[PDB]
């Protein structure tokens, strides 16, 4: 034991969400861009907005699937281009991921979806 | 009467929406881009996707506001960058409009919102 191997490097997905503020009957919005990191070593997830400010990040931890599956956690198999994920009630729309991540997904048998 | 004037030219807004397909517990999506036209002469609206295919257009007609205001129709004052509009249950997110439209909005006292 003790061999040096970085075979559990984080997978990264580019996502966005619309912050939709309901002002009476009118809904205004802005688009916010995030990088979603998935750590294969412990199946934890972390989210950060590359750009008192609220909603800029989600700490590294295992995130439960939304209801009615809160007894389970998100796995790497739940992520793909053109797929939506829900963290703390907010819907993140994944639209891309880098080559390293695309290669990893291919290695685990996942077919990455076409551009959104 | 009979004077030639093109003082009621259409206003155009660039919008997008996510076609979100729910497959069991998983939601996949794609982004579709539309041009929304508003006609000041009769307050009608028309939508077209510049790009059997369904959801590519909405014919020119006055569109009712979503519930609970279906007794009223959309007006030019309901459109702005960073504003959402709902046509036939679908949410369109306006993200831009041309100079002609921005100029018209200024002329009617509307402050166009900053980029989304």
From Swiss-Prot, chains A, B:
- According to its UniProt entry, what is the function of this protein? Microtubule inner protein (MIP) part of the dynein-decorated doublet microtubules (DMTs) in cilia axoneme, which is required for motile cilia beating.
Where does the secretion signal sit in this chain? none
Tissue specificity statement from the Swiss-Prot or TrEMBL entry: Expressed in airway epithelial cells.
Specify the DM10 domain's residue ranges.
7-109
Q: What is this protein called?
A: EF-hand domain-containing family member C2
The taxonomic lineage of its organism, from the top, reads: Eukaryota, Metazoa, Chordata, Craniata, Vertebrata
User: Where is it located?
Assistant: Cytoplasm, Cytoskeleton, Cilium axoneme; Cytoplasm, Cytoskeleton, Flagellum axoneme
The organism's superkingdom is given as Eukaryota
**Segment of the intact protein contained:** 71 to 189 of 749
Assembly mode: Microtubule inner protein component of sperm flagellar doublet microtubules.
């Amino acid at each position: 034991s003790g061999w040096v191997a970085f075979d559990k490097q984080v997978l990264s997905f580019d996502a966005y969400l619309e912050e939709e503020v309901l002002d009476k009957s009118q809904t205004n919005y802005r688009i916010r861009y995030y990088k979603i990191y998935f750590y294969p070593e412990d199946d934890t997830i972390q989210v950060n907005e590359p750009e008192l400010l609220q909603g800029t990040s989600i700490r590294r931890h295992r995130i439960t699937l939304p209801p009615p599956d809160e007894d389970q956690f998100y796995t790497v198999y739940h992520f793909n281009v053109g797929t939506e994920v829900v963290f703390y009630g907010r819907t993140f729309k994944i639209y891309d991921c880098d080559a390293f991540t695309r290669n990893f997904l291919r290695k685990i048998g996942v077919k990455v979806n076409p551009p959104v």
